[PDB]
Write an enzyme that holds these catalytic residues in place. Structure first.
Site, PDB file in Angstrom:
ATOM      1  NE  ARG A  36      23.797  39.856  51.356  1.00 42.90           N
ATOM      2  CZ  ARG A  36      23.641  39.890  52.674  1.00 42.90           C
ATOM      3  NH1 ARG A  36      23.578  38.760  53.367  1.00 42.90           N
ATOM      4  NH2 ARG A  36      23.552  41.055  53.301  1.00 42.90           N
ATOM      5  CB  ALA A  85      52.702  48.736  32.196  1.00 42.51           C
ATOM      6  CB  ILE A 133      57.968  51.310  31.686  1.00 42.75           C
ATOM      7  CG1 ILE A 133      57.849  51.841  30.253  1.00 42.75           C
ATOM      8  CG2 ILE A 133      58.230  52.456  32.664  1.00 42.75           C
ATOM      9  CD1 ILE A 133      56.757  52.872  30.051  1.00 42.75           C
ATOM     10  CB  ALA A 153      55.103  51.030  33.971  1.00 43.68           C
ATOM     11  CG  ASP A 162      35.642  42.930  43.530  1.00 37.82           C
ATOM     12  OD1 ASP A 162      36.378  42.203  42.830  1.00 37.82           O
ATOM     13  OD2 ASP A 162      34.402  42.993  43.383  1.00 37.82           O
TER      14      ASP A 162
HETATM   15  C1  MTP Z   1      31.974  39.847  32.776  1.00 39.01           C
HETATM   16  S1  MTP Z   1      30.980  39.562  34.225  1.00 39.01           S
HETATM   17  C2  MTP Z   1      31.362  40.802  35.399  1.00 39.01           C
HETATM   18  N1  MTP Z   1      32.238  41.776  35.108  1.00 39.01           N
HETATM   19  C3  MTP Z   1      32.546  42.711  35.991  1.00 39.01           C
HETATM   20  N2  MTP Z   1      31.998  42.723  37.195  1.00 39.01           N
HETATM   21  C4  MTP Z   1      31.110  41.785  37.558  1.00 39.01           C
HETATM   22  C5  MTP Z   1      30.766  40.786  36.655  1.00 39.01           C
HETATM   23  N3  MTP Z   1      29.874  40.000  37.251  1.00 39.01           N
HETATM   24  C6  MTP Z   1      29.664  40.480  38.475  1.00 39.01           C
HETATM   25  N4  MTP Z   1      30.413  41.564  38.669  1.00 39.01           N
HETATM   26  C7  MTP Z   1      30.492  42.362  39.916  1.00 39.01           C
HETATM   27  O1  MTP Z   1      31.016  41.613  41.022  1.00 39.01           O
HETATM   28  C8  MTP Z   1      30.827  42.540  42.101  1.00 39.01           C
HETATM   29  C9  MTP Z   1      31.065  41.823  43.434  1.00 39.01           C
HETATM   30  O2  MTP Z   1      32.387  41.279  43.454  1.00 39.01           O
HETATM   31  C10 MTP Z   1      29.362  42.956  41.956  1.00 39.01           C
HETATM   32  O3  MTP Z   1      29.212  44.315  42.375  1.00 39.01           O
HETATM   33  C11 MTP Z   1      29.142  42.855  40.444  1.00 39.01           C
HETATM   34  O4  MTP Z   1      28.786  44.110  39.861  1.00 39.01           O
END
Ligand code: MTP
Ligand code: ACP
Ligand code: CL
Ligand code: NA
Ligand code: NA
EC number: 2.7.1.20
Length: 351
Positions: A127, A176, A179, A182, A309
């Protein structure tokens, strides 16, 4: 219609996924496997990608994490999110994809700007990502955001949000701070965020309850803030001992030597190796957690993108349910492993 358990700010991005020929990556001077921000010479990549029948899916690091939280809580509006989008078709597509999942969102429209987009290029089981933030950079937290987020005690921001303005995350963390129940949580997001926003991040960390990050991010953090001796800044985080020292030193950036009833925890993901965390407990004593990651044959690993994530998503979900730190890490591991075993950065329907 609630209750909202988690509120996050981020860069809302529409992911355009498609399989492309190697000639494509070479044509746009892209290195297979790398995730980067579109260069001037790559601006026509998104329009060019259309001839490959791309699939549109909601993206963005923080957005991916709250979508996991929302999927797990099920009730509409269980998670809230704010970011900026453009006044273009892409913005409407992204917004609808989110409403469809029941996520509570308020996307600030930036006239004349284009909605964040990321080209997710699939080539040779690899990817390659090319992101264009566009309107994301215009995001400025509305004065009534605390009303929008009413009820949520868990706040989240990616270091990626510092690229619009560090003021957004600082304002959320500022709300936050002080608190007891929070909880402000932050993701290191990427090595460059650690360096580029050194001082703002240092201030932000003082207002942070939980810090998430992977091995390389924490390595940069340790070097930038001199958390470990110069002789150790090179050691491998694959080494438990070193990882623990890095986490322990990083915890200091959150605690500042003080101890309250507030949560102070640093969590380091380490790929297939055990997740390591350093926690300042109720009485100030520091405890180290080591949570093994259930083995997953490299054979069944489709892509590790989005793993972090999803991990955070599971962790925050468990946290909203009042689970222990170890339990939260295990939930994060479960979510991460589901995501890495199939195409997409979301939890499978069956999960
Ligand atoms: C300031 S750069 C940035 N900021 C926020 N998210 C980001 C950025 N670059 C890539 N992504 C997102 O990472 C997701 C996969 O983890 C992918 O889905 C991609 O969208
Ligand atoms: N090889 C693997 N086997 C089992 N689980 C894995 C795994 N790689 C990642 N995970 C899961 O995802 C979590 C986060 O992984 P990691 O720390 O590698 O994120 P990352 O952002 O480094 C992925 P990348 O290397 O593609 O950038 C791990 O804690 C684990 O829960
Ligand atoms: Cl983000
Ligand atoms: Na404490
Ligand atoms: Na995946």
């Amino acid at each position: 219609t609630g209750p909202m358990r988690v509120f996050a700010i981020g860069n809302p991005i529409l992911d355009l996924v498609a399989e492309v020929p190697s000639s494509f990556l070479d044509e746009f001077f892209l290195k297979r496997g790398d995730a980067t921000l579109a260069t001037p010479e790559q601006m026509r990549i998104y329009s060019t990608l259309d001839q490959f029948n791309p699939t549109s899916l909601p993206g963005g690091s923080a957005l991916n994490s709250v979508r996991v939280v929302q999927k797990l809580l099920r009730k509409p509006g269980s998670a809230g999110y704010m970011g900026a989008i453009g006044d273009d078709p892409r913005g409407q597509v992204l917004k609808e994809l989110c409403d469809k999942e029941g996520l509570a969102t308020r996307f600030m429209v930036a006239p004349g700007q284009s909605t964040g987009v990321c080209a997710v290029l699939i080539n040779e089981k690899e990817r390659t990502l090319c992101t264009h933030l566009g309107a994301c950079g215009s995001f400025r937290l509305p004065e009534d955001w605390t009303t929008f987020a009413s009820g949520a005690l868990i706040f989240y921001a990616t270091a990626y949000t510092l690229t619009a303005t560090p003021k957004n995350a600082l304002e959320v963390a500022g709300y936050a701070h002080g608190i007891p129940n929070a909880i402000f949580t932050l993701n290191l997001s990427a090595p460059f965020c650690v360096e580029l926003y050194k001082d703002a991040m240092q201030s932000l960390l003082l207002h942070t309850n939980i810090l998430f990050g992977n091995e390389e991010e924490f390595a940069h953090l340790a070097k930038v803030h001199n958390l470990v001796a110069a002789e150790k800044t090179a050691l491998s985080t694959a080494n438990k001992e070193h990882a623990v020292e890095v986490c322990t030193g990083a915890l200091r950036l959150l605690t500042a030597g003080q101890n309250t009833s507030a949560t102070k925890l640093v969590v380091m993901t380490r790929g297939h190796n055990p997740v390591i965390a350093a926690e300042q407990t109720a009485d100030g004593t520091v405890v180290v957690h080591e949570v093994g990651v259930p083995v997953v044959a490299a054979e069944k690993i489709v892509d590790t993108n989005g793993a972090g994530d999803a991990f955070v998503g599971g962790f925050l979900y468990a946290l909203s349910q009042g689970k222990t730190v170890k339990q939260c890490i295990m939930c994060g591991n479960a979510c991460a492993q589901d995501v890495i075993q199939h195409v997409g950065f979301s939890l499978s329907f069956t999960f």
